[PDB]
Amino acid sequence: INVEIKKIMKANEKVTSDADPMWYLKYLNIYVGLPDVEESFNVTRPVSPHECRLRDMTYSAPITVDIEYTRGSQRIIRNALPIGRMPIMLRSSNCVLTGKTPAEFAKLNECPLDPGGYFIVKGVEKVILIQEQLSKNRIIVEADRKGAVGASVTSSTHEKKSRTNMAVKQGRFYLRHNTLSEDIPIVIIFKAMGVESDQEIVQMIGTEEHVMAAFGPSLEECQKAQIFTQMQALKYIGNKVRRQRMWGGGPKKTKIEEARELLASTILTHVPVKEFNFRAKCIYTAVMVRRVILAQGDNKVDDRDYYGNKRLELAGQLLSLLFEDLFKKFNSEMKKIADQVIPKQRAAQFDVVKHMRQDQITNGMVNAISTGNWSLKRFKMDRQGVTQVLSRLSYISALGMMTRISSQFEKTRKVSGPRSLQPSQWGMLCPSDTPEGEACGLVKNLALMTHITTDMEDGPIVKLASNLGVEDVNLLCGEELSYPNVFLVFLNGNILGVIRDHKKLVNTFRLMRRAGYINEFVSISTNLTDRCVYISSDGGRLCRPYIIVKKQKPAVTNKHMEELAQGYRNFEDFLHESLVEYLDVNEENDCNIALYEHTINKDTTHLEIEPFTLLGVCAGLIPYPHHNQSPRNTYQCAMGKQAMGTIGYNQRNRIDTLMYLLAYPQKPMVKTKTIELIEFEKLPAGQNATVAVMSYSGYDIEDALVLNKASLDRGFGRCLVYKNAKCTLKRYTNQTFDK
Amino acid sequence: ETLEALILKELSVIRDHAGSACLRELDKSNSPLTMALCGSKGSFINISQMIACVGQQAISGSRVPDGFENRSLPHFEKHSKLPAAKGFVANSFYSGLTPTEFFFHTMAGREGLVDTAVKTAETGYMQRRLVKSLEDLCSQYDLTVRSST
Amino acid sequence: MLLFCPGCGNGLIVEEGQRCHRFACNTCPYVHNITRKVTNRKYPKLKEVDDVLG
Amino acid sequence: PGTQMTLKTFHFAGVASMNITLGVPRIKEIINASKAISTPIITAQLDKDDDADYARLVKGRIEKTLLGEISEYIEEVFLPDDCFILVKLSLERIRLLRLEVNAETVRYSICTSKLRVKPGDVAVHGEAVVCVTPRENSKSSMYYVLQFLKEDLPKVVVQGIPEVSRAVIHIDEQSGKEKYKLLVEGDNLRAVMATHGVKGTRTTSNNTYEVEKTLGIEAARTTIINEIQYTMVNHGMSIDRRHVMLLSDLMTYKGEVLGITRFGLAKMKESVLMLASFEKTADHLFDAAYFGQKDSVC
Amino acid sequence: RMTVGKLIELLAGKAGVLDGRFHYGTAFGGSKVKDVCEDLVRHGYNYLGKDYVTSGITGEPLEAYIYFGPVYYQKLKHMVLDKMHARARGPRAVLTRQP
Amino acid sequence: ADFDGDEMNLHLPQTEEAKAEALVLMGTKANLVTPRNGEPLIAAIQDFLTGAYLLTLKDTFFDRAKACQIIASILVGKDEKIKVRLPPPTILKPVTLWT
Amino acid sequence: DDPVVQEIDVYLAKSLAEKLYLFQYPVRPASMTYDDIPHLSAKIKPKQQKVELEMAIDTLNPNYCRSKGEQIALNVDGACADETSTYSSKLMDKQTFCSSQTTSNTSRYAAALYRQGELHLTPLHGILQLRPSFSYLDKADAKHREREAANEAGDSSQDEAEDDVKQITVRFSRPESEQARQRRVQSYEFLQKKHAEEPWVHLHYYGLRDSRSEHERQYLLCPGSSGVENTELVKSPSEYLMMLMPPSQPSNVLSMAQLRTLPLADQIKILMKNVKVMPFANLMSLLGPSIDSVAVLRGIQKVAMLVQGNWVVKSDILYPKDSSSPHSGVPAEVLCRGRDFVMWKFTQSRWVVRKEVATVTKLCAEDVKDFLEHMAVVRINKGWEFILPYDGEFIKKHPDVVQRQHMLWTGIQAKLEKVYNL
Amino acid sequence: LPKDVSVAELLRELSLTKEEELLFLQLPDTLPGQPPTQDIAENACTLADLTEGQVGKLLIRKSGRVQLLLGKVTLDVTMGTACSFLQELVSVGLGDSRTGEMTVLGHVKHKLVCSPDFESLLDHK
RNA sequence: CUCGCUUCGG
Ligand SMILES: Nc1ncnc2c1ncn2[C@@H]1O[C@H](COP(=O)(O)OP(=O)(O)OP(=O)(O)O)C[C@H]1O
Ligand SMILES: [Mg+2]
Ligand SMILES: [Zn+2]
Structure with missing residues (x-):
């Protein structure tokens, strides 16, 4: 709401119609303001979130914009013109609850310990779950149903997503795309993309003997056809092209041009061609072919469940996509209205202000957040269950639901692998916390100490990599790719170049990141098997702080912790002084981490801050969880999500559809440090009972337990159940009303 | 694979000898031992795991696969096939498990849970098919089993 | 083995001229007559296991 | 018992290898009566169960060996x-594996389903030398079809059952006594039984379809009974x-x-x-309406 | 189930309520068994929580020592009152006249 | 079932024929053995195997009072109309003890 | 590891700054060179640099198939057209090499000529990759298409004079939508036409064996003294690091670096707000030795008070006039009065009883606890003790400041006695 | 062929042989200097702006370290990608607007890469 | 009411 919306508006700042040129509508600046209610007749009024809860209304703020346009060729400007309403996340920058004291919270009828971070729509609390999805623009080598080891890359830019495949179905490589009638040999594509000599193609693929032995059949198949020039391959591809349902407008029986456009734009979108120079795309497809050939021997098939290839979409990215779609629809509707009105009406010049319907954006946002189904035709994205009703069974219930993560695959089928607990979840996701049932393993919880990166500018990374000796790919032929000491350096799926002595490059990059000249969330990792240095700067990656260890002694000393306790320094000071650094999953693949000081050896690069941060929020309630069997921990996480107890300090004024309270809650006698951190003891959800472990009367055979009548008579386990009964008295279209 | 088999054998030797020692040193009237002897609940393996030493954690009948590159967790060396780095849990439940051992144990538990989850649906479909096919038959009065027709 | 034309870099095939077996390119008049023995061994993997077990 | 079966692993049946599907997948494959099953096992008994040389000889006789492997x-x-x-x-490896393969056996192996390589194309020069001279077929084929042979000449079968892997x-x-048997991960029971040195009277198989087509419906019934009981016992x-x-009957x-x-249920039952x-539902109902099939309530 | 953590939690809670402290059951750490055993023996109770117990019914001592201590029990929302269900003839569905 | 919140259904047949069929064919006393292999399914379970095992251990020795109480624990329901038949004591000279 | 050997000098030459190109053949191994191949022409474009070499290949050599040469020469050209023939003779005699531009800017690349004890660098005006072009096949296909048109016309031996008058199909210059105009501008054909608009420039070839090669090879050197201090290249390592990495553009939010960028008074205020109890020597250490002690003392006297030789942040700094107690919501003036009373009690005695403070100030328990925790710790059987020890060194060094704080505390004590009726 | 190193490269280029050699070194984007009266801004300082004469020294230390002292700072020089294809350094001099000369200066065999010693620049300040 | 969606329970 502070940056992205302005970027979206700047992308769509000017709208005009083809009919009647010199007419335009230009957006200047956009504001969201503070939350308000439209109850007052043409007047706003500040509203607390609890008031929105009680009145079954939405907690939103007015989307206003200042514009300049032309009515009758005279420029008219508006400085504050409402166009929509944003549902406001609680405790956000614009939320009224932010920066408030507990007394002020009491005046606003909101619990100071409420986690916030959820929307209020039509009186219900909806939470947008963090989505998990495979990273885009990455080469994935995988086996098919028939066992053939092929490749796939889902090249996705800001506009188009296209998954292109490479197959080895008959000992030779074909490239498959949705825009081609039939998959075509890779050598024909190589010839079409500028490089025509077969020797250059073989040099790009690799100079190892088995590589030539594997790639020979493709060359023979290419030579069987008479394709030897770029024009011939372009003609072949254009023949293998399919028209998109009689595309309106015909630019001269296009074919070769269609093939060249598909090669330049549609195929491998993330790889950019400067001006119809396919050198970089040729290198990329040669690298893909080489990876397929190498993986066709030793079965080094990459696994999808590795979380170094996973990305997390928060509420911000989803809301950005939704607002972009809604704003584009609004501008399209405005342009269509302009086309329908301006050229026929009257000397009464058409102006947009009489037609800028304000319920479009507001209704779209409200419906998308409430129903939870997102339909983006501009992206062809049909998602369901994005938002869920916040569970108010207990404080732990809401807190643990606030940190949930949904999977891209659903309990719709018996899958295997994602459901499993991969070792990559270390420090990032809670191992024990998972819903017991059909969704076991597909809904996960973040660890206590974790962070999700945002997007970076990507400029200084390129500048530093260029200054660090990375040779340009265009300057050398593909044979250098096959050298044993030459390492490819990527950047978000794009070949940044080549380098020798990758150790120096990696050490310098890490040193620069520690110094602060590079953003601390930029990750650098090395894959020695593929000899590829990956530099990741996209958002959504999981990161975790670790104490830097240099020569068997941690950078953090007792004096530093004493200063932190005294308040001289904070965590950011530790970050800046090269004492603690964030590690990504891909980066921590290359590091050596010591759990404790006594485990530190000569080859240790990082130190674990605290092992108990491995567990999540719900699993933090378990006393001595390392002494139990893991299924017991999972059951306890599930059970405690459903534990009865207090909700918050405003639980009396709050009116929910179903509420459970405990008469005399008590804080636990054996409390984890996680309980202290989340202030669970302020809102306990249980009672301490004098349990005696023995067999009695045979009434406790299978998991049953015997309760004391006097204890129940004295208030033990006494509980309160609050239910809601709501009615509406609405006035109808006819001037008659319910009474 | 020979090295994997030998390492599994040695870890099993450690586990079972520790269990034998703990059972020998255990006194009578020990409630876990009493409940294991009469067979009401538990077994000697559970007693050994929760007293003496937890066994090697097995995923699909093998040691922990390397989630990262050439190693299960970053806390161990690359290409390290040491027992502690591949799933073995020297500590017992009474002593408590270190974070790596706890993670491997949780891996095994989640494997069991997902196995049960898939098994329920698969056997439900198989049961439906079998009953829909076999329900017609009846033992007649002439001692001959006959179909509906 | 795989051999490439020094002229244009396309793959060389084996054909017969009027005097001798020669390497030839499909897209240019370059040829190369064969003088002596030319061989390309591969050494395929042999079945090494005796397969006694139990 | 399908619910009770744990779908365990490591039940290698004493060989520490040869992954065989046991459990609910095994029961499903057996009751589905699929013509081709995953991991089919053929157990073969030897006339001379005590000699290892004879066991390796018959194994080489039955096991498919490619040309490039020798x-x-x-x-x-x-x-x-x-x-x-x-x-x-490599005659050393031939005698080490005790394969009854010479140069002439390889020559006879060639000229079988290889672009119709003529017998005159193949020749023998030494004791262990085979020379292949291909000629253009004129059907999009030139002399530089050499590569094609280079692709598949090592992939021609010289000895053994082609279906046997x-x-x-x-x-x-x-x-x-320590007696020797053959475990064949193949799908040709008749060929295995017919091979010399194999006591075909006492050779079984897992694929119920192959057993049926080879030895009759009663042998198929016995195989089904034994396989189901063995699979159930493997889980205790x-x-x-x-x-x-009754199920087998x-x-x-x-x-x-x-x-x-x-x-199979459509072929067995008759009630619409x-x-x-x-x-x-729809297809069966429409077909019954088309046929006018009157259905009793038996 | 091998929930040794429950036994350790019971012992730690007994020691803490005896000496007026809040013991920690932090993962991969927390108060060790030896310290709570020393606290229990210092306070006059058995060092393992097992206590001599007289049967309420017969009024005679039990043959085996009983494991006593405070445990943090939490009530769940699943109640028999909400779950209890009984159905008379009742209503039926319009499409298929079934309950 | 495991008494951990499991819900069970309960149907009431509305016909004399159905009631008789249920009582005869599906009586609990009539289905003590599973049809799969004839093994008994309805048998003693936890806290019954343990209790009986402790009871039948060679260590146990009861005087007349405790043995009488334990035996009289069963004299309810249809067993209210039977003579107890206290077995003769095993050890009787030094002390009168029932094993 | 000292620089033991080879202290080689590096010279720069700009004689061939704009005339130096690097030609690399991706398909030609370095062992085989083009020294012996007679070149025929070189076309080049100064802007949008694209060099096309035109070389001659011999025919009498055994590595040439004269039959295939005749066939390809017949295919590319006509039977005896020769008006625009890619080959002068009836055999394939000429080979075409076309250049691809590797990168736009070549400023970071330099050619280094090495001589005994010296290395001369020269900037490269451009780098191009020369590849054997296949253009005669396109011309052969075009001639095949026109031959097919001739074959179509040849269906009848004599063709009647066609009344194929070109009906006037003068097309509407349709005003193109700006999207379609942008598409046409970005079309490959438009870019190729724009490239072709620039005229070609013809160049003769002078090989390595030519004497002109050795003659112009001397231009890579520069006349200059062996030891000269360069007027430029004098920027410090910090300046160089700044140049090659240009910049993009709780209450303890600011970091230590951000604190040090702030004025000294703000730094002292923020440090006192964060710590609320700290000695003067620690403040001197934290701010930095480069800051004079008198200025630090002046700054701290405006935001802190002296208690037992230590410095405690003033109550009004912690509680602004618009703030209130987070626990009770009382106005900040009452909190300031209570904290002033607590600090006065700490000046009077090292131990403070919590119950006495609660009774005197009439405040709630948690507010008193917050007041005490900021500057005191709990000592069992003794109450609350000041967190820091009595610092007599600072008192000895600055008696005047001690007297200033003494009479300030006297005034504050008078105010507190008036307010709380002590 | 074993992978050679810059110290051994120059050592054999001067001690083992006295023949001149043509090298191709890639310099960093900005040199540690200022455009001398080039009408500026902290912009890029390339070789196109510097004048003739000695611009720096090449240091060959013990243990094979190869540095380039270009004034106050020192870069490090390492081997580039070992190219095996033909690379001809030629001079294309358009002496006339209608006719120009191509002068094959020599052959390029080895490639050097010069990078800023970032560790020294960081520990310096 | 119908329908779908989620969250549970087991
Ligand atoms: N999806 C399901 N289908 C059928 N029955 C289920 C399902 N989920 C739960 N149940 C019922 O609950 C029971 C499962 O309990 P079980 O798996 O044996 O113990 P558990 O849940 O592993 O407890 P521990 O973790 O061992 O303490 C058996 C079954 O009747
Ligand atoms: Mg249950
Ligand atoms: Zn050629």
Whole structure:
């Protein structure tokens, strides 16, 4: 709401119609303001979130914009013109609850310990779950149903997503795309993309003997056809092209041009061609072919469940996509209205202000957040269950639901692998916390100490990599790719170049990141098997702080912790002084981490801050969880999500559809440090009972337990159940009303 | 694979000898031992795991696969096939498990849970098919089993 | 083995001229007559296991 | 018991190898009566169960061996007068594996389903040298079809059953005597039985379809009973033999092994309503309406 | 189930309520068994929580020592009152006249 | 079932024929053995195997009072109309003890 | 590891700054060179640099198939057209090499000529990759298409004079939508036409064996003294690091670096707000030795008070006039009065009883606890003790400041006695 | 061929042989200097702006370290990608607007890469 | 009411 919306508006700042040129509508600046209610007749009024809860209304703020346009060729400007309403996340920058004291919270009828971070729509609390999805623009080598080891890359830019495949179905490589009638040999594509000599193609693929032995059949198949020039391959591809349902407008029986456009734009979108120079795309497809050939021997098939290839979409990215779609629809509707009105009406010049319907954006946002189904035709994205009703069974219930993560695959089928607990979840996701049932393993919880990166500018990374000796790919032929000491350096799926002595490059990059000249969330990792240095700067990656260890002694000393306790320094000071650094999953693949000081050896690069941060929020309630069997921990996480107890300090004024309270809650006698951190003891959800472990009367055979009548008579386990009964008295279209 | 088999054998030797020692040193009237002897609940393996030493954690009948590159967790060396780095849990439940051992144990538990989850649906479909096919038959009065027709 | 034309870099095939077996390119008049023995061994993997077990 | 079965692993049946599907997938494959099953096992008994040399000889007789697996090197030589492929047989490995394969056996193996290589093309020069001289077929074929041969000349079968993939020498370590059997991961029971040195009277198989087509419907019934009981026993849970015998009799009472799938159920049962209720409701109902099939309520 | 953590939690809670402290059951750490055993023996109770117990019914001592201590029990929302269900003839569905 | 919140259904047949069929064919006393292999399914379970095992251990020795109480624990319901038949004591000279 | 050997000098030459190109053949191994191949022409474009070499290949050599040469020469050209023939003779005699531009800017690349003890660098005006072009096949296909048109016309031996008058199909210059105009501008054909608009420039070839090669090879050197201090290249390592990495553009939010960028008074205020109890020597250490002690003392006297030789942040700094107690919501003036009373009690005695403070100030328990925790710790059987020890060194060094704080505390004590009726 | 190193490269280029050699070194984007009266801004300082004469020294230390002292700062020089294809350094001099000369200066065999010693620049300040 | 969606329970 502070940056992205302005970027979206700047992308769509000017709208005009083809009919009647010199007419335009230009957006200047956009504001969201503070939350308000439209109850007052043409007047706003500040509203607390609890008031929105009680009145079954939405907690939103007015989307206003200042514009300049032309009515009758005279420029008219508006400085504050409402166009929509944003549902406001609680405790956000614009939320009224932010920066408030507990007394002020009491005046606003909101619990100071409420986690916030959820929307209020039509009186219900909806939470947008963090989505998990495979990273885009990455080469994935995988086996098919028939066992053939092929490749796939889902090249996705800001506009188009296209998954292109490479197959080895008959000992030779074909490239498959949705825009081609039939998959075509890779050598024909190589010839079409500028490089025509077969020797250059073989040099790009690799100079190892088995590589030539594997790639020979493709060359023979290419030579069987008479394709030897770029024009011939372009003609072949254009023949293998399919028209998109009689595309309106015909630019001269296009074919070769269609093939060249598909090669330049549609195929491998993330790889950019400067001006119809396919050198970089040729290198990329040669690298893909080489990876397929190498993986066709030793079965080094990459696994999808590795979380170094996973990305997390928060509420911000989803809301950005939704607002972009809604704003584009609004501008399209405005342009269509302009086309329908301006050229026929009257000397009464058409102006947009009489037609800028304000319920479009507001209704779209409200419906998308409430129903939870997102339909983006501009992206062809049909998602369901994005938002869920916040569970108010207990404080732990809401807190643990606030940190949930949904999977891209659903309990719709018996899958295997994602459901499993991969070792990559270390420090990032809670191992024990998972819903017991059909969704076991597909809904996960973040660890206590974790962070999700945002997007970076990507400029200084390129500048530093260029200054660090990375040779340009265009300057050398593909044979250098096959050298044993030459390492490819990527950047978000794009070949940044080549380098020798990758150790120096990696050490310098890490040193620069520690110094602060590079953003601390930029990750650098090395894959020695593929000899590829990956530099990741996209958002959504999981990161975790670790104490830097240099020569068997941690950078953090007792004096530093004493200063932190005294308040001289904070965590950011530790970050800046090269004492603690964030590690990504891909980066921590290359590091050596010591759990404790006594485990530190000569080859240790990082130190674990605290092992108990491995567990999540719900699993933090378990006393001595390392002494139990893991299924017991999972059951306890599930059970405690459903534990009865207090909700918050405003639980009396709050009116929910179903509420459970405990008469005399008590804080636990054996409390984890996680309980202290989340202030669970302020809102306990249980009672301490004098349990005696023995067999009695045979009434406790299978998991049953015997309760004391006097204890129940004295208030033990006494509980309160609050239910809601709501009615509406609405006035109808006819001037008659319910009474 | 020979090295994997030998390492599994040695870890099993450690586990079972520790269990034998703990059972020998255990006194009578020990409630876990009493409940294991009469067979009401538990077994000697559970007693050994929760007293003496937890066994090697097995995923699909093998040691922990390397989630990262050439190693299960970053806390161990690359290409390290040491027992502690591949799933073995020297500590017992009474002593408590270190974070790596706890993670491997949780891996095994989640494997069991997902196995049960898939098994329920698969056997439900198989049961439906079998009953829909076999329900017609009846033992007649002439001692001959006959179909509906 | 795989051999490439020094002229244009396309793959060389084996054909017969009027005097001798020669390497030839499909897209240019370059040829190369064969003088002596030319061989390309591969050494395929042999079945090494005796397969006694139990 | 399907619910009770744990779908365990490491039940290698004493060989520490040869992954065989056991559990619910095994029961599903057995009751489905699929023609081709995953991991089919053929157990073969030897006439001389005590000798290892005889066991390896019959294993080499039955197991498929490719040309590239025995030839020490294959080289494409382009002499100034002619170009041809030379294959050098490693006689040391041939006698080590005790394969009854010479140069002439390889020559006879060639000229079989290889672009119709003429017998005159193949020749023998030495004791373990094979020369192949291909000629253009004129059907989009030139002399530079050499590569094609280079692609598949090592992939021609010289000895063994082509359907058989791999046979292993299993040994029973009985205190009285250590006797040798063959475990064949193939799908050709008739060929294995017909091979010399194999006591075909006492060779079984896992694929119920192959056993049926080879040895009759009663042999198929016995195989079904034994396989189901063995699979159930592998998980430690017991089922009375009468239940599995009844199931096998139902599967094999029409003279053909019929699975419990919708196709076999359609072939077995006759009532329209049950067929419609189980699967493919609309298709069954429309076909019954077309045929005018009157259905009783038996 | 091998929930040794429950036994350790019971012992730690007994020691803490005896000496007026809040013991920690932090993962991969927390108060060790030896310290709570020393606290229990210092306070006059058995060092393992097992206590001599007289049967309420017969009024005679039990043959085996009983494991006493405070455990943090939490009530769940699943109640028999909400879950209890009984159905008379009742209503039926319009499409298929079934309950 | 495991008494951990499991819900069970309960149907009431509305016909004399159905009631008789249920009582005869599906009586609990009539289905003590599973049809799969004839093994008994309805048998003693936890806290009954343990209790009986402790009771039948060679260590146990009861005087007349405790043995009488334990035996009289069963004299309810249809067993209210039977003579107890206290077995003769095993050890009787030094002390009168029932094993 | 000292620089033991080879202290080589590096010279720069700009004689061939704009005339130096690097030609690399990706398909030609370095062992085989083009020294012996007679070149025929070189076309080049100064802007949008694209060099096309035109070389001659011999025919009498055994590595040439004269039959295939005749066939390809017949295919590319006509039978005896020769008006625009890619080959002068009836055999394939000429080979075309076309250049691809590797990168736009070549400023970071330099050619280094090495001589005994010296290395001369020269900037490269451009780098191009020369590849054997296949253009005669396109011309052969075009001639094949026109031959096919001739074959179509040849269906009848005599063709009647076609009344194929070109009806006037003068097309509407349709005003193109700006999207379609942008598409046409970005079309490959438009870019190729724009490239072709620039005229070609013809160049003769002078090989390595030519004497002109050795003659112009001397231009890579520069006349200059062996030891000269360069007027430029004098920027410090910090300046160089700044140049090659240009910049993009709780209450303890600011970091230590951000604190040090702030004015000294703000730094002292923020440090006192964060710590609320700290000695003067620690403040001197934290701010930095480069800051004079008198200025630090002046700054701290405006935001802190002296208690037992230590410095405690003023109450009004912690509680602004618009703030209130987070626990009770009382106005900040009452909190300031209570904290002033607590600090006065700490000046009077090292131990403070919590119950006495609660009774005197009439405040709630948690507010008193917050007041005490900021500057005191709990000592069992003794109450609350000041967190820091009595610092007599600072008192000895600055008696005047001690007297200033003494009479300030006297005034504050008078105010507190008036307010709380002590 | 074993992978050679810059110290051994120059050592054999001067001690083992006295023949001149043509090298191709890639310099960093900005040199540690200022455009001398080039009408500026902290912009890029390339070789196109510097004048003739000695611009720096090449240091060959012990243990094979190869540095380039270009004034106050020192870069490090390492081997580039070992190219095996033909690379001809030629001079294309358009002496006339209608006719120009191509002068094959020599052959390029080895490639050097010069990078800023970032560790020294960081520990310096 | 119908329908779908989620969250549970087991
Ligand atoms: N999806 C399901 N289908 C059928 N029955 C289920 C399902 N989920 C739960 N149940 C019922 O709950 C029971 C499962 O309990 P079980 O798996 O044996 O113990 P558990 O849940 O592993 O407890 P521990 O973790 O061992 O303490 C058996 C079954 O009747
Ligand atoms: Mg249950
Ligand atoms: Zn050629």
